[PDB]
Design a protein around this nucleic acid. Sequence first.
DNA 1: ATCAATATCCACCTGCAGATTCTACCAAAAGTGTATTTGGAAACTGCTCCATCAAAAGGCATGTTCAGCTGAATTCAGCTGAACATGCCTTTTGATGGAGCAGTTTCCAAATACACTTTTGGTAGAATCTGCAGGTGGATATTGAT
DNA 2: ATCAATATCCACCTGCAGATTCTACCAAAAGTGTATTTGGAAACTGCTCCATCAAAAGGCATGTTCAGCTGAATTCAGCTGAACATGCCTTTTGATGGAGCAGTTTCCAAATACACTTTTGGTAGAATCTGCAGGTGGATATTGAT
Lengths: 85, 77, 92, 91, 108, 104, 99, 96
Amino acid sequence: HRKVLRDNIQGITKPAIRRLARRGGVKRISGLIYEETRGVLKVFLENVIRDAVTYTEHAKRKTVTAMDVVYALKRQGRTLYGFGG
Amino acid sequence: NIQGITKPAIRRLARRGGVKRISGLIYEETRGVLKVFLENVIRDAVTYTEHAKRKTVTAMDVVYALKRQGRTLYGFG
Amino acid sequence: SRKESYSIYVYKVLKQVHPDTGISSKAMGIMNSFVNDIFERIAGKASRLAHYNKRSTITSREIQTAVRLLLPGELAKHAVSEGTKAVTKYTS
Amino acid sequence: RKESYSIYVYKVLKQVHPDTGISSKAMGIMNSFVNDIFERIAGKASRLAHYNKRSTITSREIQTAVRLLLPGELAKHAVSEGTKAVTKYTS
Amino acid sequence: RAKAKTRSSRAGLQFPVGRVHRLLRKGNYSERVGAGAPVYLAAVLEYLTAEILELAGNAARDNKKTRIIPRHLQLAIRNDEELNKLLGRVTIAQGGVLPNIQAVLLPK
Amino acid sequence: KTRSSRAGLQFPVGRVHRLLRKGNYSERVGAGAPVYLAAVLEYLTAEILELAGNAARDNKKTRIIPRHLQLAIRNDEELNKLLGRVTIAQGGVLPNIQAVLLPK
Amino acid sequence: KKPHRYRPGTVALREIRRYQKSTELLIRKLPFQRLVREIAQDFKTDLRFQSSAVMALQEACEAYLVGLFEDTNLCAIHAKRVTIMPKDIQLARRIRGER
Amino acid sequence: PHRYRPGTVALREIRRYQKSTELLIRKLPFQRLVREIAQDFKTDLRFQSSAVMALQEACEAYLVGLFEDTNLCAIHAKRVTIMPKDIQLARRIRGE
DNA sequence: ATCAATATCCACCTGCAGATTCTACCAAAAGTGTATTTGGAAACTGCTCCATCAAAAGGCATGTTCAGCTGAATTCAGCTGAACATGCCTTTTGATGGAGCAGTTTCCAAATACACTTTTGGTAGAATCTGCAGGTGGATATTGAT
DNA sequence: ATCAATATCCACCTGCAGATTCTACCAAAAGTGTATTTGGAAACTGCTCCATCAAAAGGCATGTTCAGCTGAATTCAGCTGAACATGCCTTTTGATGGAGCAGTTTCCAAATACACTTTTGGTAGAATCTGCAGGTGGATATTGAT
Ligand SMILES: [Cl-]
Ligand SMILES: [Cl-]
Ligand SMILES: [Cl-]
Ligand SMILES: [Cl-]
Ligand SMILES: [Mn+2]
Ligand SMILES: [Mn+2]
Ligand SMILES: [Mn+2]
Ligand SMILES: [Mn+2]
Ligand SMILES: [Mn+2]
Ligand SMILES: [Mn+2]
Ligand SMILES: [Mn+2]
Ligand SMILES: [Mn+2]
Ligand SMILES: [Mn+2]
Ligand SMILES: [Mn+2]
């Protein structure tokens, strides 16, 4: 119903990635970092979303919840605070 | 007693780890590292031992202690 | 529609340690996450402990040992002291 | 006294490699392996059942647990085997 | 009938012992649960909460604020060696990071 | 007849059922859960023994030893991932020399 | 009479101080939301999301990236550089056990 | 007299020890260390022998893993020689 | 890149010690036949929130130019760390007692389970309360070209 | 050894979005009584471990020599940061349907419970047969003199 989504990884822009690196303390950035970062992100996101949906399907739901994501993130060895209830 | 972990022993560990050349300062550095690790693991192992009101650290005590290090050890169950 | 949470207790503790300080709702959410996280860590470790020792009962002893296994150093000693105190007072 | 998966691991060994044996130490590693994966799957299935306010671990929690814990092809393959076994059993 | 007293006031606690007991019963952690278990656990949960709130309140006032926000919690956790260890794989939403610039990056 | 044989399995369905009932996992355990779990466990065991058996005979040994399990596991990307934080006692490591360390 | 111009690095350092002091999300929300929906759409069609699920995903993703960039930065510096490069990212992820 | 060039034997030792699985630390000093450390946590401890061997398998696998990472750090910096700073970068990125 | 010379790695061998496989006894666990209860799924349905779009304003992404300074490449030697011979001492391997833990069994007092009934702390929503976000302006460390 | 151009710091202000307090019903904790499970004290008993003693082998400590790796010094091309114009699309705030969570109610398919028999898996010695300790020869590298 909405316009088919395509090529949205490019929404993670060069200046956004630059900001993320800055918060991470990075002063200077190779031109090739941007595509590398997109790839790394896509993989992380795919994996987390993959697991979240597995929780959503298991519950016979159509709506991914915040807790689905919180549990999904455990497979990445990450505990996310702030999204219960 | 930490000096009981000799330079050639450490060097054999490095070789199995694929290292071709080794700084003179590695041995002391490695001993420090080893010590920390051993302390942590042994501390938890004994916690299990104490919990069971035993005086003898068992292999399984060690296996469970290694989970806190996020390490799973196969072969001692 | 009724949802329980640790919010009122976290706020009571807050007023104890910083009587003139408040807390945002998002921060309260991080605290509720924290309490639930540690609850499951301690409870799970105590459960595995009881099972390893073939006891069917989680007692304060399993809780104490789990706490020693999960917490670093000084934090562990301090927590064990608080818990031991609460148990002795309670049983009195 | 003490139980282990040794005779079942040895049966599987004989199916896949009829003339091959296994050392005591290797068998100890296989036993560790089976207990480890058992606890991962059983534990994940349990937390899943609880997350959904169900008191029963069924094969559906096992299947979902397997999808959460195993990578890729191993996951698809394990799920197919589990599903086959339940279907044969229920016959 | 004797006048009710909470297990929490009996143990000298703010955190809910009865609720913790119920949560222990329904998490299938063990088939039986000792009388002191929920008390000890409520007390540990309460104590850790006090520790994090103490440090976070301190950051809040070192920033001229009367209200703790996620940032104060993050500052509290990451500047304390043991909390930082305990919560090493935890992400605090809206927490940001510690101000830290590597010395080599500073100007000449 | 045993439940294991009804399921086409070698792994013990009854033992798995009991271990689930008493491991404090849930109040109840469904009839298909131990069948499913025993089958998953059996499948992974066969996968590892298949590969380790191959290494064992590529070393001309009739008996699988921990080394062979380590070789089987670390040379398979999925098994290696599933077991990424596991130490196999007496398994050693994969022969691996970084190319920069070689002569010439 | 020439226009004033900071030297390379000065503004970069200013930006580090700026974003390390703040906590706002650094990726634009709506583009991030499109990314999440595109990816999820490829696992199961017509999914809906709680609003907070999208925000949970964005918090976890930005925390992950900033952490990776801290490690990456250490790798670049180790190699006597000040500029992060793909091999820095790859070493970080390898030692982290992601690769 | 014959003399191998520096590095040749090192490489040979790498092939040798990567092919084998034997414990690389001597048993008695390791055991002595374990008992010493154990003293600081609980008095009058005994150890099962297999507990000591469990501790040693774990310690050696840990160290071998750490050296692999350490080596990757040395090589990153265009060296072939591992140094304390390599170990320290490795442990920092591991979260140790 | 040759030969010649040299050292080490790697199948392949045998004999036999010992590690694995086979065997048989037997508690303990699984199976079995019946009986009984109950979790959760289906079928509802109310009613949150979610999807999507709308408009408008301005924050920010993009693309360009240009040059400062970074990374990459190169050179060279001081001194680190490898390789090797020698001979001592620490570990290893094997023998022997015996003290002291684990591991058990019985059996009651004490602990915990769990239903029933009663009370009150916790919640949701309404009503109050107020920090601090932005907004404005001036002071003030900092930067870079002179 | 300055200034001009900038960015950043620091009070001070107020309104209202978000936080805290108030209110009152009721879900769930608590008090009470009865049933069921368990912990540990006492009295065992083998059997792991610790202590000790001993010889000897091979691994290590040490000292020597020098190959070649690291780090310093140097040079330069072109990448990446800084800054500016342009104009898009994100943000913000609100609308409009309606998908799909949740809340209820009913009631079997599936699960538990229990008494008892049957089957099996763990254990430890016997019987089998693999690996391994050394030994040899061929394949394979390495090193140095040209
Ligand atoms: Cl208790
Ligand atoms: Cl089932
Ligand atoms: Cl690169
Ligand atoms: Cl160093
Ligand atoms: Mn798609
Ligand atoms: Mn009955
Ligand atoms: Mn019901
Ligand atoms: Mn440079
Ligand atoms: Mn020279
Ligand atoms: Mn009241
Ligand atoms: Mn402000
Ligand atoms: Mn009611
Ligand atoms: Mn049998
Ligand atoms: Mn040999």
